[PDB]
């Protein structure tokens, strides 16, 4: 059972003018659960937000909704705010504790994120595929999502550099299958 906490950040993000095109699934590269991010970031100063803030933060049993992606953008892919940026077009969710959690716990954090994404896709009328389910590294060259990639592909972008398209697709296809599973029930 998944708790969703609607507790919006202390700042107002620009309107998009349309529903999200899909979901970018990030890893937080961090050490906090969804609740811990909420506790520290829901009511915070702009100095914290200016360093980046995604729409959603998920871990086992819990998703914090920082920004309603339905009509508002977020700062998650680092490619500016133009109409072709991931920030403008895509909702962003972080799988939390991607450094601190054990493999078993992190994999459960991922499943909470897939189930939530599935719920969003139903609301926004989207079908999961390589166009609607995305990686941060497709927008700017980074090693995110580092933990998901190493567990699901065996390739570690932290130590091995940029992965090939086939490695990226192996990971996206895994995300897509699971989101599809939850949408089907
Ligand atoms: Zn629309
Ligand atoms: Zn990312
Ligand atoms: Zn610690
Ligand atoms: Zn451990």
Author numbering: 189 to 373
What does the paper say about this structure?
The staphylococcal phage lysin LysGH15 demonstrates great potential against methicillin-resistant Staphylococcus aureus (MRSA). Lysin (also known as endolysin) is a cell wall hydrolase that is synthesized at the end of the phage lytic life cycle and is involved in cell lysis and the release of progeny particles from host cells. LysGH15 shares very high sequence identity with other lysins of class III staphylococcal phages, such as LysK, phi11, and MV-L. Moreover, these lysins possess a modular structure containing an N-terminal CHAP domain (cysteine, histidine-dependent amidohydrolases/peptidases), a central amidase-2 domain (N-acetylmuramoyl-L-alanine amidase), and a C-terminal SH3b domain (the SH3 bacterial binding domain, which typically contains 60–70 residues and is homologous to eukaryotic SH3 proteins). To elucidate the molecular mechanism, we determined the structures of three individual LysGH15 domains using X-ray crystallography or nuclear magnetic resonance (NMR).
The structure of the amidase-2 domain (residues 165–403) was determined at 2.27 Å resolution. PSI-BLAST analysis using the National Center for Biotechnology Information (NCBI) database reveals that the amidase-2 domain contains a conserved zinc-binding site. Structure-based mutagenesis also confirms that E282 and the zinc ion play an important role in maintaining the lytic activity of the amidase-2 domain. In AmiD, E104 (E282 in the LysGH15 amidase-2) and a zinc ion activate the water that is bound to the zinc ion, which favors the nucleophilic attack of the amide bond; the tetrahedral intermediate is stabilized by K159 (this site is occupied by T330 in the LysGH15 amidase-2 domain). Here, we find that the amidase-2 domain of LysGH15 from phage (virus) also contains this conserved residue (i.e., N275) at a corresponding position as other amidase members. Therefore, the amidase-2 domain may cleave specialized substrates of the peptidoglycan, such as the bond between N-acetylmuramoyl-L-alanine.
